[PDB]
Amino acid sequence: DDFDFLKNLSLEELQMRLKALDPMMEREIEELRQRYTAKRQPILDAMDAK
Amino acid sequence: GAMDDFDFLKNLSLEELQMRLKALDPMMEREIEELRQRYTAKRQPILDAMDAK
What we know:
The structure is a homodimer. Helices cover 86% and strands 0% of the residues of chain A. Chain A is mainly α. Chain A has a single domain (1-50), classed as CATH 4.10.170.10. Chain B: This is Serine/threonine-protein kinase 3 20kDa subunit.
């Protein structure tokens, strides 16, 4: 925040910026899921290895 | 890394491995919830700018 800059921008530009946050968030969420896949697989494998 | 992690896990009991497994998803979801809140905050100055026109 950042408002002091954003307030000077057109509505179209603000619309574009707000929209850009969605795929950005989704990328972060996917990376998080992938991080947990890396934790989950070896636990499952360890269980199946006994 | 991955090899050291598997080496560690293979020495745990089945009971502790199952506990660790079931703990993963709730933990993941906590992190995702916190993430979504952070983005709510990121949107706010843009939302306010739109509304200050």
